mmCIF file of N, CA and C and ligand atoms in Angstrom:
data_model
loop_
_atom_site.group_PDB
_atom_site.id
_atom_site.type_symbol
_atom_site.label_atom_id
_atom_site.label_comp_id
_atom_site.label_asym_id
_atom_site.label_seq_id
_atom_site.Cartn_x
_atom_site.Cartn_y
_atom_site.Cartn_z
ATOM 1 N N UNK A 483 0.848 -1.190 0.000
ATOM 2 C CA UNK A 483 0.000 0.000 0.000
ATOM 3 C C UNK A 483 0.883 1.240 0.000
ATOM 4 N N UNK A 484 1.439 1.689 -1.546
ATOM 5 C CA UNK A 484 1.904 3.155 -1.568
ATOM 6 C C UNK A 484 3.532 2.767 -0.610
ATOM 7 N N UNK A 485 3.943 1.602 -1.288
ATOM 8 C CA UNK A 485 5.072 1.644 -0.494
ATOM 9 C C UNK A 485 5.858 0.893 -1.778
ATOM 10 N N UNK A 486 6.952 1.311 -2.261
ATOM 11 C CA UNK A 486 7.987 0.246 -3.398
ATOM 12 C C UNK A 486 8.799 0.431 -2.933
ATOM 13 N N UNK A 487 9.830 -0.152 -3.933
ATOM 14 C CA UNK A 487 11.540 -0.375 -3.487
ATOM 15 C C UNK A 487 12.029 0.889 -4.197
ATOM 16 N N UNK A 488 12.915 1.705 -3.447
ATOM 17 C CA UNK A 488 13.158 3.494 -3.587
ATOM 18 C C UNK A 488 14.713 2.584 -4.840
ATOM 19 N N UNK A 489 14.676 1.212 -5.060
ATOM 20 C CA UNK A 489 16.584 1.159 -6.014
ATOM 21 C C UNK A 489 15.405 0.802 -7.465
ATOM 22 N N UNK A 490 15.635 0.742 -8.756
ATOM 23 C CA UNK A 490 15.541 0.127 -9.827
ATOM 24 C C UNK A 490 16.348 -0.036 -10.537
ATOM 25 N N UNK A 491 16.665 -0.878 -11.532
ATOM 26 C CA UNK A 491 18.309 -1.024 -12.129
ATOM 27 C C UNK A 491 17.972 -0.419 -13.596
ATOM 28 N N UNK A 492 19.049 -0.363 -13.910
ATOM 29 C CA UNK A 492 18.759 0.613 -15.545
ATOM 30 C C UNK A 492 18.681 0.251 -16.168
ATOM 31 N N UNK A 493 18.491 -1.239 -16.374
ATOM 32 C CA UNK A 493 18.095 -2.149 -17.805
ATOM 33 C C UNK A 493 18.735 -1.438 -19.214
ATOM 34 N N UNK A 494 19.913 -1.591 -19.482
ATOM 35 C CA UNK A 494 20.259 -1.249 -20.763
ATOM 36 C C UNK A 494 20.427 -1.744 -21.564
ATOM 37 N N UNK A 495 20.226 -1.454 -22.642
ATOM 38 C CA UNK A 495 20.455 -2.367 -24.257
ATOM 39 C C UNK A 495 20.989 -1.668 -24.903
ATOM 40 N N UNK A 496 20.928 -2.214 -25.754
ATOM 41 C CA UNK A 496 22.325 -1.624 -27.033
ATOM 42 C C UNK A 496 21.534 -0.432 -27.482
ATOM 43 N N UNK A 497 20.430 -0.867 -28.248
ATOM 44 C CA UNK A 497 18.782 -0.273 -28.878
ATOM 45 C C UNK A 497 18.586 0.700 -28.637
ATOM 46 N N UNK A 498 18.730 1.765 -27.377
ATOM 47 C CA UNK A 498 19.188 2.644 -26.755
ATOM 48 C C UNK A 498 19.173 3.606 -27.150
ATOM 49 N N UNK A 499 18.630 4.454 -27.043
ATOM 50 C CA UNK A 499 19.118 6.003 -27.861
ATOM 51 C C UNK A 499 20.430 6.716 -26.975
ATOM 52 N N UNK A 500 20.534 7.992 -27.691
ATOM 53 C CA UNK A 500 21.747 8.533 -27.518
ATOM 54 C C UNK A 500 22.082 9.150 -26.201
ATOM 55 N N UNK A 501 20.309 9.459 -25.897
ATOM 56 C CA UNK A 501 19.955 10.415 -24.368
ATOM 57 C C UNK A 501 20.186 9.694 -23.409
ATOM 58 N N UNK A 502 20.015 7.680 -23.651
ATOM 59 C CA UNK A 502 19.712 7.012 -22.342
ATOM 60 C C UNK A 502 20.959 5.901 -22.406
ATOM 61 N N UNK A 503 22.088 6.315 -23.474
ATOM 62 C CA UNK A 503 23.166 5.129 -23.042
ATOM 63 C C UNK A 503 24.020 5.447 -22.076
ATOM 64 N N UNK A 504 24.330 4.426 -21.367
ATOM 65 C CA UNK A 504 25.612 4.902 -20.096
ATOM 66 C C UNK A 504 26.602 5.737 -20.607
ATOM 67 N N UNK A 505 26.926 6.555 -19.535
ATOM 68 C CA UNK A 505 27.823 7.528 -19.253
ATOM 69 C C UNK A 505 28.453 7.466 -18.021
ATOM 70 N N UNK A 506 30.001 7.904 -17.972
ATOM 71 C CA UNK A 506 30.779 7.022 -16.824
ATOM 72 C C UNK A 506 31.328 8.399 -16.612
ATOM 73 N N UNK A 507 31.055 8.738 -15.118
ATOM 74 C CA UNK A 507 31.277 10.295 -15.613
ATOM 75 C C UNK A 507 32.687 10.139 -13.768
ATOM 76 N N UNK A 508 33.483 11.099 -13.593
ATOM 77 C CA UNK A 508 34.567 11.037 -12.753
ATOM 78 C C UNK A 508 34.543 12.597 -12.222
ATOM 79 N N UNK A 509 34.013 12.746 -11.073
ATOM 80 C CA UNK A 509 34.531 13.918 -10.165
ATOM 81 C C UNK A 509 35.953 13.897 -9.394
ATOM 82 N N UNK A 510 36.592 14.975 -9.902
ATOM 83 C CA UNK A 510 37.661 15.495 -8.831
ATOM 84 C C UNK A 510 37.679 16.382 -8.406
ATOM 85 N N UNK A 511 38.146 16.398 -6.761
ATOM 86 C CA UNK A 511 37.961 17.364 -6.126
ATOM 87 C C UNK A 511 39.285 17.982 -5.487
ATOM 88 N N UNK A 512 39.348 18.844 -5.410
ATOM 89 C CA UNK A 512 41.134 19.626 -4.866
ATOM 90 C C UNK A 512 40.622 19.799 -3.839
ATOM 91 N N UNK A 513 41.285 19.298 -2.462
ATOM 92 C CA UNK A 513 41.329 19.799 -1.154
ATOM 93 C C UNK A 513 42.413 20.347 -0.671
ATOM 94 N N UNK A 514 42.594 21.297 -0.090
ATOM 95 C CA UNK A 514 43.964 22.315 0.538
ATOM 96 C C UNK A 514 44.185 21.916 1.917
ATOM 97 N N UNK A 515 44.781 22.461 2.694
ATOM 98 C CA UNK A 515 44.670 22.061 4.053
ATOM 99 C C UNK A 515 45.893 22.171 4.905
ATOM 100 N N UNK A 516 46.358 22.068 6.048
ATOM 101 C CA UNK A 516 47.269 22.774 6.890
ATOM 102 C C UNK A 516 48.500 21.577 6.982
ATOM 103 N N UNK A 517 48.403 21.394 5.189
ATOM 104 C CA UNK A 517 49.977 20.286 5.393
ATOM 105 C C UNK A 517 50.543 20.856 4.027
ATOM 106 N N UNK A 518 51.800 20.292 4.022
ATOM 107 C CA UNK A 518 52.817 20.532 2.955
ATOM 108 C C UNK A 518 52.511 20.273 1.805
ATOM 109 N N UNK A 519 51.577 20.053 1.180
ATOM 110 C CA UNK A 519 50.589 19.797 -0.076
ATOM 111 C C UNK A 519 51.413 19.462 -0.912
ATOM 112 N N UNK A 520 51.973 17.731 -0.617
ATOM 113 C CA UNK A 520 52.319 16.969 -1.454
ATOM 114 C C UNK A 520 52.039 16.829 -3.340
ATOM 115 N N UNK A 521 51.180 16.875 -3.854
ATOM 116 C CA UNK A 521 50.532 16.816 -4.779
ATOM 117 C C UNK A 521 50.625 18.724 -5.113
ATOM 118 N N UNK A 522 51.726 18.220 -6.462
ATOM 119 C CA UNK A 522 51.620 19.807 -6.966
ATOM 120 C C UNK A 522 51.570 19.857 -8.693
ATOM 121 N N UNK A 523 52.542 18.786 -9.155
ATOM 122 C CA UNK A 523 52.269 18.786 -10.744
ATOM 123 C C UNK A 523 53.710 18.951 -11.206
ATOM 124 N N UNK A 524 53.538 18.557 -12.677
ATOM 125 C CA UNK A 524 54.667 18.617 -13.579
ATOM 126 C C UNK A 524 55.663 19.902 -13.191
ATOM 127 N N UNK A 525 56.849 19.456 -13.179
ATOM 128 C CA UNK A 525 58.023 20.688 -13.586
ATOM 129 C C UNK A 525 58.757 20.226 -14.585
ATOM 130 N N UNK A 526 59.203 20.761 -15.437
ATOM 131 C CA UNK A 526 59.566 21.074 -16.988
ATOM 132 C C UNK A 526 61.376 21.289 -16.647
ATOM 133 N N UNK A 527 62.235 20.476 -17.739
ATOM 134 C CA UNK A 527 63.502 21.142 -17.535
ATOM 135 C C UNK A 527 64.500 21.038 -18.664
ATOM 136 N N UNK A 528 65.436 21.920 -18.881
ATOM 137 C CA UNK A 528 65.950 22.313 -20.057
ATOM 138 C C UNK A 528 67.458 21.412 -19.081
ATOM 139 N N UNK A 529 68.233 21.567 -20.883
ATOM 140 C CA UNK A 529 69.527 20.720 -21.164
ATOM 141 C C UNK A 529 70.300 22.505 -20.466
ATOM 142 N N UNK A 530 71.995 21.803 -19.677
ATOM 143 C CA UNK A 530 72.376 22.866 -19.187
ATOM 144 C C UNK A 530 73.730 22.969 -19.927
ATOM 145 N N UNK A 531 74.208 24.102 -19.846
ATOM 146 C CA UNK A 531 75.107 24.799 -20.951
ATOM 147 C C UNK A 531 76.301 25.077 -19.685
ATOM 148 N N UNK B 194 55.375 21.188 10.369
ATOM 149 C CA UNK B 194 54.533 20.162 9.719
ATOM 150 C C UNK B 194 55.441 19.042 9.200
ATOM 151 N N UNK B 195 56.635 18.822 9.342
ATOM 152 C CA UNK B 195 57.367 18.338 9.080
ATOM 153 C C UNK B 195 57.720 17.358 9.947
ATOM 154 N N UNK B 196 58.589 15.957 10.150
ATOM 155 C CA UNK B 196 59.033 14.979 11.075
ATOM 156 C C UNK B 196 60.136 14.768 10.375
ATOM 157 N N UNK B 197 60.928 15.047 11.543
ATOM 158 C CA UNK B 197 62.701 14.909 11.230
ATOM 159 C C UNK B 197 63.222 13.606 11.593
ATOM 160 N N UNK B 198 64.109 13.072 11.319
ATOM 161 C CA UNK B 198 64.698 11.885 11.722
ATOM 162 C C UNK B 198 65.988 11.874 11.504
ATOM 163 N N UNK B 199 66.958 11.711 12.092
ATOM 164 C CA UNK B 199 68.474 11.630 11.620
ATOM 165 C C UNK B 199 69.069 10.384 12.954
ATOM 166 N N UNK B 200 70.079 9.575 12.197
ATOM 167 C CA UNK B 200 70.406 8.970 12.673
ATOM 168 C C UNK B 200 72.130 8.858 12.340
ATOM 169 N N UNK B 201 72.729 7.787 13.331
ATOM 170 C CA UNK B 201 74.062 7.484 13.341
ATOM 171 C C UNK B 201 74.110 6.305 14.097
ATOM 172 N N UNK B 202 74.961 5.192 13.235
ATOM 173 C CA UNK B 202 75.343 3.724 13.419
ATOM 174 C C UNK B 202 76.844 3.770 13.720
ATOM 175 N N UNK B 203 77.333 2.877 15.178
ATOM 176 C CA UNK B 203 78.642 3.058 15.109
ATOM 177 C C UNK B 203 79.001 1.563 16.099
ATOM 178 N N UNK B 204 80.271 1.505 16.033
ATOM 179 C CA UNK B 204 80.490 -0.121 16.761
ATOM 180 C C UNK B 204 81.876 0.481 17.700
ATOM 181 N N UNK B 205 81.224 -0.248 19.122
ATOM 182 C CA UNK B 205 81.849 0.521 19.869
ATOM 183 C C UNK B 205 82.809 -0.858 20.708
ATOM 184 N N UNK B 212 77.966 2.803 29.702
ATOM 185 C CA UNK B 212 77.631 3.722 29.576
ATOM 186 C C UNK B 212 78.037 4.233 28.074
ATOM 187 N N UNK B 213 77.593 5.466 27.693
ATOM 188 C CA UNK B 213 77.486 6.459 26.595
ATOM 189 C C UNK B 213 79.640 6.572 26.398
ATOM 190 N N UNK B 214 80.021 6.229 25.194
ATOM 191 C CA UNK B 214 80.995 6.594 25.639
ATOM 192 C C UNK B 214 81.777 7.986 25.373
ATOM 193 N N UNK B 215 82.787 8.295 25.522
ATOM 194 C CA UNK B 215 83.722 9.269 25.058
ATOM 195 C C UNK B 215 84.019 9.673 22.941
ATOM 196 N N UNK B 216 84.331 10.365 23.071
ATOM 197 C CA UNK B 216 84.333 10.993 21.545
ATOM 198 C C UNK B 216 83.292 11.931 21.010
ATOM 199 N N UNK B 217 83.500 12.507 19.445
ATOM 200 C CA UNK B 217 83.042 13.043 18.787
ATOM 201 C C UNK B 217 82.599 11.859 17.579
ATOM 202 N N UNK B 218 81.119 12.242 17.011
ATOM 203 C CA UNK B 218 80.266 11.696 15.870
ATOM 204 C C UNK B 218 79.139 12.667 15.764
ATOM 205 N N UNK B 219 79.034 12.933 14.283
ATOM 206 C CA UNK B 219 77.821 14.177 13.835
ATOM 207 C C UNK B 219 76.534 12.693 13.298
ATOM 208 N N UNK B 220 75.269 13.340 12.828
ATOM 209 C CA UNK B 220 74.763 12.778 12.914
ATOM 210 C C UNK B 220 73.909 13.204 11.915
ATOM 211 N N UNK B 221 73.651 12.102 10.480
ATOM 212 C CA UNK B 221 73.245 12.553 9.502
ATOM 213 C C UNK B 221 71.570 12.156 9.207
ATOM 214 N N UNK B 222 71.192 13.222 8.612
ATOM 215 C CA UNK B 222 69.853 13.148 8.302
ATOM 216 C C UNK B 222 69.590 12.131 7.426
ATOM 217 N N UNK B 223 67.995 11.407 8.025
ATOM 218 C CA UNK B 223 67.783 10.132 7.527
ATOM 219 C C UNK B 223 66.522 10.153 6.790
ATOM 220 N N UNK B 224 65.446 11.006 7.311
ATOM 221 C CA UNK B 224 64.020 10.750 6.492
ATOM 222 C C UNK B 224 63.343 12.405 7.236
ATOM 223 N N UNK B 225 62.549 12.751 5.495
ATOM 224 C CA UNK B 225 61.299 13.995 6.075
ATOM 225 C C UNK B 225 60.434 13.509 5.588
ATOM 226 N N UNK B 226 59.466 13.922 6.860
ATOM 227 C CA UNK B 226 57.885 13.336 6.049
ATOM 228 C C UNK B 226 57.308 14.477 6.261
ATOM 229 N N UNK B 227 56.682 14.799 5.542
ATOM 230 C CA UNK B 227 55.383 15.483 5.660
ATOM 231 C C UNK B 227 53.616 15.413 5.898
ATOM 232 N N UNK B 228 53.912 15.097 7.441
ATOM 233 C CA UNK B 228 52.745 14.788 8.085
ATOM 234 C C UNK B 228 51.766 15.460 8.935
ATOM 235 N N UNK B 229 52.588 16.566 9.632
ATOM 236 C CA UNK B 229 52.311 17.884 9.957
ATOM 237 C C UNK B 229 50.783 16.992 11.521
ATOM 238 N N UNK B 230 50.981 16.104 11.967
ATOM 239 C CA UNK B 230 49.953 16.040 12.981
ATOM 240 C C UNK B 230 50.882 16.536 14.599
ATOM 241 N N UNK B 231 49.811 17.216 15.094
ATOM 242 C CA UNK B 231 50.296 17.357 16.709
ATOM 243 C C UNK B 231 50.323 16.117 17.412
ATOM 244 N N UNK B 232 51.767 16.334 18.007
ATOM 245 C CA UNK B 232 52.738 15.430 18.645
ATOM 246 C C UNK B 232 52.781 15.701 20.481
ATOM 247 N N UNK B 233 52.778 14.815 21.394
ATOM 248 C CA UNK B 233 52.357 15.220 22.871
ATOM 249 C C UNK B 233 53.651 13.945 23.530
ATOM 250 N N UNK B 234 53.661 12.754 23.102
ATOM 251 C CA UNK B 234 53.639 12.002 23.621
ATOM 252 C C UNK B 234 54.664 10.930 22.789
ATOM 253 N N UNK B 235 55.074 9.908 23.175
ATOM 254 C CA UNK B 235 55.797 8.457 22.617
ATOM 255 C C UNK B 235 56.388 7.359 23.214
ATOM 256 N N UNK B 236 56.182 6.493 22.881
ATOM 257 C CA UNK B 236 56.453 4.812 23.634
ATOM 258 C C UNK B 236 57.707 4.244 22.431
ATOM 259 N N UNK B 237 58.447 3.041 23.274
ATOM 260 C CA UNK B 237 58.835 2.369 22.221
ATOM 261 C C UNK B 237 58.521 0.988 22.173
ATOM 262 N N UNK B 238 59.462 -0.179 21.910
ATOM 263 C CA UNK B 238 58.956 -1.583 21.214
ATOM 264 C C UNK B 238 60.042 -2.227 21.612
ATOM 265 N N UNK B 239 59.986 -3.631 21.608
ATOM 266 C CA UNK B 239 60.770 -4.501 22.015
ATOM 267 C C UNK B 239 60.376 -6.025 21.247
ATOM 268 N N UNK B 240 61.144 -6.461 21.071
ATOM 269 C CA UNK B 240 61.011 -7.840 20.411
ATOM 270 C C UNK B 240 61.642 -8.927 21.154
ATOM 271 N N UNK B 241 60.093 -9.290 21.902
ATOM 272 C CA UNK B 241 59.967 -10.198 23.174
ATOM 273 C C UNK B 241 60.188 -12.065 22.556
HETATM 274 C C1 NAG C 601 47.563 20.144 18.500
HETATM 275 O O1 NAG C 601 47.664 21.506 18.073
HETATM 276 C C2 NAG C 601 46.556 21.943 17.272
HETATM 277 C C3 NAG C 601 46.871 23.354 16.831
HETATM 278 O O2 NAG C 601 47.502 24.093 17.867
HETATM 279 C C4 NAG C 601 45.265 21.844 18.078
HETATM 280 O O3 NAG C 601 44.167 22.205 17.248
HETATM 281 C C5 NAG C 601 45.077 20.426 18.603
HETATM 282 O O4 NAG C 601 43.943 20.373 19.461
HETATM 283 C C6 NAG C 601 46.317 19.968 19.365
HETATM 284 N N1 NAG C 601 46.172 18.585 19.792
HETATM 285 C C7 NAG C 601 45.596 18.233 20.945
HETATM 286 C C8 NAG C 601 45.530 16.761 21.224
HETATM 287 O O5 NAG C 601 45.147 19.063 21.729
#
């Protein structure tokens, strides 16, 4: 009575249009914080003379 | 924010002489420090 299951699975097929095929999507997030912030990125370096 | 460590190995109470003592590991861990125990291999 007015009660279902809140999961359903996404049943996909190939058949599919363009709006409803999976998409695998990846958040990143930058956090800062009161340490030596390991994680900084590429440095670049030239031949020395 | 830093943890220092330096050490010195030598083959010998505390005895007599001079030895400097070279840096071994930095970490960068930066947590507040109060306290420390050590270990034994019973
Ligand atoms: C260690 O120092 C920080 C900053 O001064 C403080 O926020 C923290 O509460 C201290 N640790 C303890 C166990 O009090």
């Amino acid at each position: 009575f007015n009660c279902y299951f809140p999961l359903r699975s996404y049943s996909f097929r190939p058949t599919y249009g363009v709006g409803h095929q999976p998409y695998r999507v990846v958040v990143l997030s930058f956090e800062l914080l009161h340490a030596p912030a390991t994680v900084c990125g590429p440095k670049k370096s030239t031949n020395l003379v | 924010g830093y943890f220092k460590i330096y050490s010195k190995h030598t083959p010998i109470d505390l005895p007599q002489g001079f030895s400097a003592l070279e840096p071994l590991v930095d970490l960068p861990i930066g947590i507040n420090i109060t306290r420390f125990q050590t270990l034994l291999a019973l």
